[PDB]
């Protein structure tokens, strides 16, 4: 997660080297807030991207404006997720429930 948008949707972005998820909007309801923080209070979020940036305007092709911004915010978090041990391996892994595993029984 990075920041809150105007509408209320969230600016949650996966590392494209790890997650294959771009700068994406996602509502807070469909979110498992894990108790694992990284100090992103030193990154520079781009001001030009807002709620109108992520609108479904009208076959989808990634525009050449879009491929700029995914790289520009990556250059600070990609070293930051490697300054933390076994963190880039955490993001490649996908959340799932096994037998004998109950969400209300566990803390995350």
């Amino acid at each position: 997660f990075l920041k809150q948008l105007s509408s209320g949707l969230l600016l949650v972005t996966g590392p494209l080297s790890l997650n294959r998820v771009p700068l994406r909007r996602t509502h807070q309801k469909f979110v498992i807030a894990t108790s694992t923080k990284i100090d992103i209070s030193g990154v520079k979020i781009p001001k030009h991207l807002t709620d109108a940036y992520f609108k479904k305007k009208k076959k989808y092709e990634i525009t050449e404006q879009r491929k700029v911004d995914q790289k520009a915010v990556d250059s600070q978090i990609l070293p930051k997720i490697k300054a933390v041990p076994q963190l880039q391996g955490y993001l490649r892994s996908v959340f799932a429930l096994t037998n004998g595993v109950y969400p209300h029984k566990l803390v995350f």
Binding site: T34, S35, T36, Q86, G89, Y90, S93, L106, V107, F108
Partner: protein
Amino acid sequence: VFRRFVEVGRVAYVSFGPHAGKLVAIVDVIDQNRALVDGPCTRVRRQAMPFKCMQLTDFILKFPHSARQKYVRKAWEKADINTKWAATRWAKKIEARERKAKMTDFDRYKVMKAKKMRNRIIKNEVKKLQRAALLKAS
């Protein structure tokens, strides 16, 4: 053969209730199913407590059968129970469950990746112990 006796001074471990997860010392025996119990250094006031919510240890300390709380604290400070109790293999496996209970999802992930590699080097050692036992035994 019994080794755990409800007597005056055996430290007990409270099982359920608002005093669960705490030590306590039996002052007086009220009845067959109720005891006068007291833990001074563990935030449990002297009160009447049934024999359900207690799992007796083998920590016994001498003081009279109805001695008041200051004579309870000094004997607890004479035998130094809290240092003795945390070193037990009983208290360590209570502490091991809550850690596995409060274990973070990311803490659940690092322990999984380490579980995969700690078992292979066990498994490969068993393999070289499998075939090398099949040489000397023939």
